[PDB]
């Protein structure tokens, strides 16, 4: 309804739009972060609504910048603001400061774009993974619909984020391979995800510490992965 | 100014304002957007002729520039002034950047337009979907949708409007990639008949080519549907 | 309830939910605390415990100037926004008067900030609470600014979950912070937020922030290799 | 003043002649720059000054008309419209902060019937524009250093019923009379003429 | 129930609810009381303290608005400090544009201007405290009381918050022609710690303010050896 | 104050504008007007308020502007409107300026589409922005342009317009467009069309004899141009025939209105023989 | 600060707050007007509250410019504010053209004024029907404006408590011979059927347009037309 | 919905102005003012129960300008707010014009201020009659003669010979309505009009009145000023009264 204001607290101390924004991305497609010493893996399930969407149109991994991707999970359009948002602030900062923005830097710019809702009637029902690799190494932030930014080891957002923290728990150590971290994406993402895992079905993405480069793996490269598992 | 907050969420993560918008959406007119090899056809059903509309020849497939036609679904008015903003952004780029603005790039403008109006607080939704053909300057063909939420796919072959998930759930059965400019107006036609009345009157469609759009006259137009129609008959006695 | 939906509805009994509700946002945030001594101020986070080999880090604690720092509770986007805030009055303060801005004067500026957000329908209270802690030429000051606007300047404080059992711990302690030693003050900070902790889970440098502020040290904040000389020999014992 | 513009309106085409000349105080960049822009089918305009307002202000008329023929249903403006869409634009802008567009413009059209009810100017149209916003229907004018030359020699020699070919030969001696007697090396024409069938690029006269 | 939900609304009865509603806020909070002398004004509020650990003069309910006036807070302190604040550009406006120390019943009266705008308008709620101004400008020692309405008055003795019914009969006590400030002070404190439950509200202090010919007509905190 | 907004601009969950919806019943309560396009002409026949014998004429000095029903936006465009003509005459003047805005900018009358095109995306405006209610007004569009040549638009509140060849709006809009379906074909005499616009305003409402009293007549038409000024401007082309917006008086409606009488007349003759 | 419409369209297309602010309009002192071949008188009962209100501060009948005045029905504050708008645009006018408004002009200008406050934010309509009543170049006119912004010429009409019974009256009495010593008369006699107690120059005030001006009969001038009815 | 915004009810009334006047009446004070030959007064109960109240502090009384007395009934601090306003558009058009604002100016554009806020959603009524008092210049000859100008909540501006605002005004009202059939009360001396004024006063609250219960407002041709009268001439007054 309209009766209760958009900048209205609940009894239990959470802004309800915020609230509600959150339970948007539990709709959405599941994406997942793992942060390995090698580079950082960003895999998303496609969730094509049919067979005759050409599936590199709806992309759910986008470049901010050679060395920073983000994965979307809840609603993809305002995800591109966000993200679009991120580039404009990533390129300020090369051409300000002659250097590569750091992920975290680029991750508070995401979320500076995300506080300002009253300008804007709602919050952004996107939940963002933001992967890359700066000088701190290969880092993993997620940012919220209330603005909040939270660096991760490894996370998951979206549909199955919850059943695939469970399986986080049991396999991630911090001293994953980078070969080791996509199997484990690709792995999540087949048990999570409620269509048959394909090459086209899932996008995957790593940046890698050794380059600082972001890869997104084409779907010859995702079969690669799920020959080996 | 109003700028009251319009589209919100609700309890369960919905924006109700946008699935209203979508509700618009699935009572517009069916529209069906067919790729093939060298050709985009844009099919779209009219309201059908009554013999009041003025016999002069009003085209439901607007122009948005040379390179790029759309199709829309849902509110003729809301659909005019997203029309008018893309063939604007057009042209404003042609004056930005010399070269004419990809399919792509417009989708990707009038799908932004589409998203600011399920968060300009004052404003509800445009209550239309968008099927948007065209070629690059290069030479690839291209075909896009773009729904109320403001969220844009490309797609093969691809249905708006009024039973848009029969149309879709069909093409997707028999659609082929590789199609000659005769069989994409062929499976335009076929795909569009699913849901439309049986008339051919009520069917207008436009065939684009690399530098070559041209409306199917009701002439050229029954061959098709006469040939469709009879293929129709023939999947009927064989279920 | 019709009265706790708007910012700018008192209730019948002189009550503003929307205030009393904001609070709630501080009261379920993780635990900080604040103790100050005669030339120091230290403040003290939980920060959420890694899940299994899973690590988390949300920036709770923020140097805001030379001579000040925060710790929040609540929201954590608007944390940062206050962070901004007081960040770009200190650099202001600092630009024009060659000085940090003085604390009970950062306090009231807080204040104010909170209060313009409690009375406007458009705005709305902020879900979080501030452990200013910050040295002048009066000596060290730890404030606990609140949604509701009021701000109290504290011997030691803590807000935040299970912030009631910190309290109770430092309100046996507090009257000798003034005599203690810096090293005195950081046990005692971290006795008190250990108080705060759940069941069985014990302080270590992965899942606390220590922030130190005084006569002669800028506000510094401790984690991993600094945080350890305070920690490692660190244990909780009734 | 440096680039010379001539055009002329016969009873079946106009003509339209621009220096190639693009200087650069005194090095000349090009003598091959084409300032006749094409604005629709029959439709173009010799446009003469710096190359950057002259652009800037072809390419907004282009545009604008362009943008103008989509929301009208692919409806072709006429000449006298577009020459004062123009000349408005151009007189709008000598009282903007920006100031005067520093452009000359000679606006060539054919107007051709659009439907069956259209009772308008059938064919070819020339529109004199100062940069100030002065708009002028003329059989002939100029812009340029060269413009008063060959406004004489048109004075002279030009009839309303030359052939094509009787234009080329005038168009020749107009821009051959630049060439002889302005200073500035106008040593290149483009020549451009609209007729019923469109816009042809003469490349004979140079 | 929408007759009551802001104070851009009249009920039938002619009273605007939302501005009723602030003055219980007002009721509800710690007791202040005021005294105007000859020699000056004094202003005594109780604070209670929610925490044994807060500092000396935390949530000072008691501010200097000028040089010669200063505004105690009884009602929300946050609310009140906007009340200080806006006193002050004021106070300061006195003096910037009319070179003058803003008389105590002109900044009395755009105290209650601010407070009242705040009952007017949809999008604002009325201030949650009643301001006491006390002022010793060119208009001698004037004690005035802006509440949540906007409604000033001017009193020579006045008592606000939960023991106002009280603390009044304790000033109707005292012969306001006759008393000093250094006797208020020691009067106004006594009837503060006589009026306050001993029980609800353990922890407590009483902020004392005056501005008196003693002050040299400047607007202070009475020292800590007066106060009792 | 939020608490009071009727929300105008929001979708219902059936994905409508109910504002809108309820702007379209405001105009099916006003009077009807019909719209018969010819080749030599458009026609507006509209349903004036019943005359109280104390109504006075604005005495006005151009009767050919403006009428109870139709007016003219300018030379070569004219409207009539249905719906509440207050809002009516807030677009009307936005129409008039839109019209002159496109001669001041191009020096040509503006296509009658674009003027359509441009009052339909003000009221739309209003279905979508501002938290206000919409335009409870529809109008009949009639013109002539080099373009299309005579035309008739329709023009709903919620912004969409059609071109038609004849239409009604207002009261009985659906008996009306029965009754022109049947009648209206594509050559058509303007005399043949203005015996329509009246045979099918006046079955609408209900009367034996079209009653004078209660319609007004507009004729969009080309008429031999007079004022051509060729000397004022040697090279400005001046079209033979120029459109010409014209209000019928009484006395130039009665004969108009005779024949329709006499129409409706001899198809009664032939329902008697039906039955026979 | 309220931008969002107070006046709406119902389920059956009317605009509900037009209707009750035409219902307010109807609700004040009996006004009419009565167009003759050589000028108009228009007349309203001022019926004060009681005896102690000075008689000639109420102002029942107003001044637009020379050459046009109007009364009212309804809220008065709400018609000061058409008067006060409608004198401001008889200025410009003037100054524009150097010609009096025509009143066909000046009444579409306070028709627009009506409609604006049916339409825009966070303003309700005006509660009030004007008579207006000049003289132009097109002859003696005699207009009402409805809460609606609805206009109309009339040849006689009246507005407010008793116009139903005083518009009947008007319609026997009314003739197109009818000159503006006769139609003073009859304006007058209207008011007198309606009336409750005597009338007088203190009761009723009467503008009427002559020649080529408009003016408020003074008291004597009104005592001479009481004493003949 | 029609009684908490300013919009028309079915029967075409403004609820929120209806509740406005009885804001006026609410605070049970009750103002009296009378206009004379040459003299406007204006009285207004000045009740403070409260012995710790600063009577001079609590006026119903203010000067908006040397020659324009107000007297505000209703909510105070509305009033204060009116007055303030009036203050503003007085010296504004003191600036726009290089004379005093006339009274019935004056009254008239407060009337429009007040308008404003019935026709405008979310602004409050200012719950207040105010009373503008004070001399006006004829034209014809230059003499100066009292005016009473009364503003209320719906906006209407009236001038009178006498009017009552506040508690139990119908009955005061009733009183100087009966004391108007006997006297012209335009004939008056300004003493004759301050006993009847006070005599309304007396009669309406239904209980004698002390001079220090009564704030006393006054014009006169003499001396044009709006000035307090002082509690020693009121005493006279009420002396005055209880004897005839």
């Given at each position: 309804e309209y009766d209760r204001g958009v900048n209205t607290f609940s009894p239990?101390?959470?802004?309800f739009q915020i609230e509600y924004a959150v339970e948007a991305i539990k709709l959405g497609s599941t994406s997942l972060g793992i942060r390995t010493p090698e580079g950082v893996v960003l895999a998303a399930?496609?969730?094509?609504?049919?067979?005759?969407?050409?599936?590199?149109?709806?992309?759910k991994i986008m470049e901010v910048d050679s060395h920073i991707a983000a994965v979307m999970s809840g609603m993809v359009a305002d995800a591109r603001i966000l993200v679009e948002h991120a580039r404009v602030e990533s390129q300020n900062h090369r051409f300000t400061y002659n250097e590569p923005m750091s992920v975290e830097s680029c991750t508070l710019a995401t979320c500076d774009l995300s506080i300002q809702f009253g300008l804007m009637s709602r919050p952004f029902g996107v939940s963002l993974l933001i992967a890359g690799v700066d000088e701190k190494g290969p880092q993993l932030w997620q940012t919220d619909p209330s603005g909040t930014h939270t660096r991760y080891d490894a996370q998951a957002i979206g549909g199955g984020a919850e059943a695939a923290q469970s399986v986080f728990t049991e396999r991630y150590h911090r001293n994953m391979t980078l070969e080791e971290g996509e199997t484990l994406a690709v792995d999540i993402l087949k048990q999570v995800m409620e269509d048959q895992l394909s090459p086209e079905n899932i996008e995957v993405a790593v940046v890698r510490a050794d380059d600082g480069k972001l890869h997104m793996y084409t779907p010859t490269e995702i079969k690669a992965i799920m020959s080996r598992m | 100014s109003y700028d009251r907050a319009i589209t919100v969420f609700s309890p369960d993560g919905h924006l109700f304002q946008v699935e209203y918008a979508q509700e618009a959406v699935k009572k517009g007119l069916a529209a069906v957007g067919v790729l093939g090899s060298d050709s985009v056809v844009i099919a779209v059903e009219k309201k059908s002729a009554v013999?009041?509309?003025?016999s002069r020849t009003i085209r439901k497939?607007?122009?948005?520039?040379a390179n790029i036609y759309l199709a829309f679904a849902g509110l003729s008015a809301d659909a005019r002034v997203l029309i008018n903003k893309a063939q604007l952004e057009c042209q404003r780029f042609s004056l930005n950047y010399e070269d004419t603005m990809d399919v792509d790039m417009l989708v990707r403008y009038v799908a932004g337009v589409q998203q600011k109006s399920t968060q300009s607080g004052g404003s509800r939704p445009f209550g239309v979907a968008t099927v948007i053909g065209g070629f690059n300057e290069d030479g690839k063909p291209h075909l896009w949708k773009t729904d109320p939420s403001g969220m844009c796919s490309a797609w093969r072959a691809v249905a708006i409007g009024r039973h848009d998930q029969t149309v879709i759930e069909y093409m997707e059965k028999s659609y082929k990639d590789g199609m000659s400019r005769d069989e994409c107006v062929h499976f335009a036609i076929k795909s569009l008949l699913e849901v439309v009345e049986?008339?051919?009157?009520?069917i207008e469609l436009l065939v684009l080519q690399y530098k070559e759009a041209r409306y199917l006259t009701e002439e050229e137009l029954q061959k098709f549907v006469v040939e469709v129609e009879k293929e129709r008959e023939e999947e009927a006695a064989a279920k | 309830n019709e009265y706790d939906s708007d910012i700018t509805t008192w209730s019948p009994?002189?009550?503003?939910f929307q205030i009393e509700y904001a609070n709630e946002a501080v009261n379920n945030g993780s635990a900080t605390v604040g103790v100050k001594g005669k030339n120091f101020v230290v403040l003290a986070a939980l920060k959420r415990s890694p899940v299994a080999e899973l690590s988390s880090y949300q920036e709770?604690?923020?140097?805001?100037?030379e001579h000040v720092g925060m710790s929040i509770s609540g929201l954590v986007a608007d944390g940062r926004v206050l962070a901004r805030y007081l960040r770009t009055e200190c650099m202001n303060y600092r630009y024009m008067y060659s000085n940090g801005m003085p604390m009970n004067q950062m306090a009231d500026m807080i204040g104010e900030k909170h209060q313009r957000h409690i009375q406007c329908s458009g705005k709305r209270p902020f879900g979080v609470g501030l452990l200013l802690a910050g040295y002048d030429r009066q000596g060290p000051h730890l404030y606990q600014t609140v949604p509701s606007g009021d701000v109290y300047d504290y011997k030691a404080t803590a807000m935040g979950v299970r912030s009631q059992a910190s309290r109770t711990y430092l309100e046996r302690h507090f009257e000798h912070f003034s005599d203690c030693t810096l090293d005195e003050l950081v046990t005692h900070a971290l006795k008190a937020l250990a108080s705060?902790?759940?069941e069985g889970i014990e302080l270590n440098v992965k899942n606390t922030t220590i922030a130190i502020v005084g006569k002669d040290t800028p506000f510094t904040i401790f984690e991993e290799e600094s945080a350890r000389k305070y920690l490692d020999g660190f244990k909780m014992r009734p | 003043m440096a680039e010379t513009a001539i055009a002329f309106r016969c009873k079946d085409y106009v003509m339209v002649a621009a220096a190639g000349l693009n200087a650069f105080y005194y090095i000349k960049?090009?003598?091959?720059?084409?300032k006749i822009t094409q604005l629709d089918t029959h439709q173009l305009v010799a446009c003469t000054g710096e190359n950057g307002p002259r652009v800037n202000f072809t390419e907004y008329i282009k545009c604008n008309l362009a943008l103008n023929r989509m929301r009208q249903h692919g409806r072709h403006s006429s000449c006298e419209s577009t020459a004062n869409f123009m000349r408005n634009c151009l007189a709008s802008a000598?009282?903007?902060?920006?100031?005067?567009?520093?452009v000359n413009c000679l606006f060539a059209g054919y107007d051709t019937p659009?439907?069956?009810?259209d009772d308008g100017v059938v064919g070819p149209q020339l529109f004199y524009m100062d940069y100030l916003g002065t708009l002028q229907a003329v059989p002939y004018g100029c812009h340029g250093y060269g413009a008063c030359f060959v406004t004489a020699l048109l004075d002279r020699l030009w009839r309303p019923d030359l052939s094509q070919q009787e234009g080329l030969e005038l168009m020749q001696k107009c821009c051959d009379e630049v060439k002889r007697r302005?200073?500035?090396?106008?040593?290149y024409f483009f020549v451009k003429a609209v007729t019923k069938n469109g816009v042809e690029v003469i490349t004979a006269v140079h | 129930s929408g007759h009551d939900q802001s104070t851009d609304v009249f009920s039938a009865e002619g009273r605007v609810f939302q501005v009723e509603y602030a003055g219980k806020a007002v009721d509800n909070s710690s007791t202040a009381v005021a005294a105007c002398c000859k020699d000056g004004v004094v202003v005594a509020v109780e604070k209670v303290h929610t925490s044994r650990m807060l500092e000396k003069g935390?949530?000072?309910?008691i501010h200097a608005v000028d040089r010669q006036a200063g505004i105690c807070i009884c009602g929300l302190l946050p609310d009140g400090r906007a009340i200080v604040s806006r006193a002050r550009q004021e106070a300061e406006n006195s003096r910037d544009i009319f070179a003058t120390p803003i008389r105590g019943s002109v900044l009395a009266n755009r105290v209650g201007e601010f407070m009242h705008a705040y009952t007017t308008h949809f999008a604002y709620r009325p201030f949650g405290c009643s301001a006491i101004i006390a002022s010793y400008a060119d208009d001698g020692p004037q004690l005035f009381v802006s509440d949540p309405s906007g409604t000033v008055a001017g009193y020579y003795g006045v008592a606000l918050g939960k023991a106002k019914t009280v603390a009044k009969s304790e000033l109707e006590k005292l012969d306001f022609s006759s008393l000093t400030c250094d006797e208020a002070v020691g009067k106004l404190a006594s009837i503060l710690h006589e009026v306050h439950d001993k029980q609800k509200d353990k922890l407590y202090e009483v902020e004392v303010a005056w501005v008196c010919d003693k002050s040299d007509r400047k607007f202070v905190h009475v020292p800590a050896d007066m106060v009792p | 104050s939020h608490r009071y907004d009727s929300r105008t601009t929001t979708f219902s969950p059936e994905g409508r504008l109910y504002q809108v919806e309820y702007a379209v019943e405001a105009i099916q309560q006003a009077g009807t007007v019909i719209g018969v396009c010819t080749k030599d002409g458009v026609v507006l026949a509209g349903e004036k308020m019943v005359?109280?014998?104390l109504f006075d004429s604005?005495?006005?000095?151009?009767?050919?502007?403006?009428?109870e029903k139709m007016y003219k936006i300018a030379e070569h465009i004219g409207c009539s409107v249905a719906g509440v003509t207050s809002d009516a005459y807030a677009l009307l003047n936005y129409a008039r300026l839109s019209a002159l805005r496109h001669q001041y900018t191009f020096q040509e009358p503006m296509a009658i589409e674009d003027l359509c095109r441009i009052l339909c995306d003000e009221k739309q405006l209003y279905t979508q922005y501002g938290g206000v209610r919409p335009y409870g007004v529809s109008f009949l569009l009639v013109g002539w342009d080099r373009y299309y040549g005579y035309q008739l638009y329709s023009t709903e509140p919620s912004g969409d317009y059609s071109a038609w060849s004849a239409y009604a709006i207002g009261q009985n809009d659906q008996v009306a467009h029965a009754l022109l379906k049947k009648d209206w074909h594509e050559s058509m005499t303007l005399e043949d069309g203005m015996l329509l616009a009246l045979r099918v305003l006046g079955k609408t409402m209900d009367?034996?004899?079209?009653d004078l009293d209660r319609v007004e007549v507009a004729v969009m038409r080309k008429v031999p141009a007079s004022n051509i000024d060729q000397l004022l401007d040697p090279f400005k082309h001046h079209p033979k025939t120029t459109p010409r917006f014209q209000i019928l008086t009484r006395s130039e409606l009665k004969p108009h209105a005779e024949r329709a009488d006499q129409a409706r007349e001899a198809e009664e003759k032939a329902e008697a023989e039906r039955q026979r | 600060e309220a931008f969002y419409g107070l006046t709406t369209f119902s389920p059956s297309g009317k605009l509900i707050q037009i209707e009750y602010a035409t219902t307010a309009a109807g609700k004040g002192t009996t006004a009419l007007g009565v167009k003759a071949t050589d000028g108009v008188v228009i007349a309203a009962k001022k019926?004060?509250?009681?005896?102690?209100?000075?008689?000639?501060?109420?102002?029942?009948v107003f001044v637009l410019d020379e050459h046009v005045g109007c009364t009212y029905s309804g809220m008065g504050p709400d018609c000061r504010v058409l008067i006060d708008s409608a004198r401001k645009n008889c200025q410009q006018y003037k100054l524009m053209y150097n010609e009096p408004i025509p009143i066909s002009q000046l009444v579409r200008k306070i028709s627009a004024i009506y409609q604006e406050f049916t339409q825009s934010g966070g303003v309700r309509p005006f509660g009030c029907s004007l008579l207006v009543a000049g003289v132009d170049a097109n002859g003696y006119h005699l207009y009402q404006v409805d809460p609606s912004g609805t206009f109309w010429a009339w040849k006689a009409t009246a507005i407010g408590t008793g116009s139903p019974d005083a518009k009947a009256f008007l319609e026997k009495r009314?003739?197109?011979?009818?000159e503006l010593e006769d139609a003073v008369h009859t304006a007058l006699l209207t008011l007198k059927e309606g009336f409750d107690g005597q009338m007088t120059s203190e009761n009723t005030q009467v503008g009427r347009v002559v020649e080529n001006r408009f003016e408020i009969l003074s008291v004597d001038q009104l005592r001479d037309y009481l004493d003949q009815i | 919905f029609d009684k908490y915004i300013t919009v028309f009810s079915?029967?075409?009334?403004?609820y929120q102005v209806e509740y406005a006047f009885k804001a006026v009446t609410y605070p049970g004070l009750l103002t009296v003012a009378i206009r004379c030959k040459d003299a406007v007064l204006v009285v207004t109960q000045?009740?403070?129960?409260?012995?710790?109240?600063?009577?001079?502090?609590?006026?119903?009384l203010y000067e908006v300008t040397p020659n324009i007395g107000c007297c505000m009934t209703g909510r105070a601090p509305d009033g204060r707010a009116l007055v303030q306003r009036a203050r503003e558009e007085a010296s504004d058009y003191q600036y726009r014009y290089g004379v005093e604002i006339p009274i019935a100016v004056l009254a008239k554009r407060m009337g429009d201020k007040a308008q404003v806020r019935t026709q405008q959603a979310g602004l409050r009524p200012m719950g207040v009659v105010s009373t503008f008092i004070g001399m006006d210049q004829s034209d014809q000859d230059g003499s100066l003669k009292p005016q009473i100008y009364t503003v209320d909540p719906a906006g209407w501006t009236g001038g009178h010979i006498a009017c009552a605002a506040g508690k139990k005004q119908v009955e005061a009202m009733a009183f100087l309505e009966k004391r108007q059939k006997s006297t012209e009360?335009?004939?008056?001396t300004q003493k004759e009009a301050a006993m009847i004024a006070l005599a309304a006063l007396q009669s309406a609250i239904g209980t004698a009145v002390k001079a220090k219960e009564v704030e006393v407002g006054r014009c006169t041709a003499a001396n044009p000023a709006f000035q307090r009268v002082p509690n020693s001439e009121v005493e006279e007054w009420l002396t005055a009264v209880a004897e005839a």
């Open positions: 239990e101390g959470r802004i399930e496609k969730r094509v609504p049919s067979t005759l969407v050409v599936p590199s149109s709806m992309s | 013999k009041l509309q003025d497939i607007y122009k948005v520039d049986s008339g051919s009157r009520n | 009994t002189g009550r503003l709770k604690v923020f140097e805001i100037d705060a902790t759940s | 960049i090009t003598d091959a720059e084409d000598i009282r903007s902060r920006e100031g005067a567009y520093q659009v439907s069956e009810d302005v200073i500035i090396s106008n040593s | 935390s949530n000072n309910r | 005359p109280h014998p604005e005495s006005m000095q151009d009767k050919n502007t403006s009428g009367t034996a004899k079209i | 019926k004060a509250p009681s005896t102690l209100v000075d008689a000639s501060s109420i102002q029942k009314y003739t197109v011979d009818m | 079915p029967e075409g009334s403004l000045h009740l403070i129960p409260d012995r710790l109240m600063r009577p001079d502090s609590v006026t119903a009360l335009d004939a008056l």
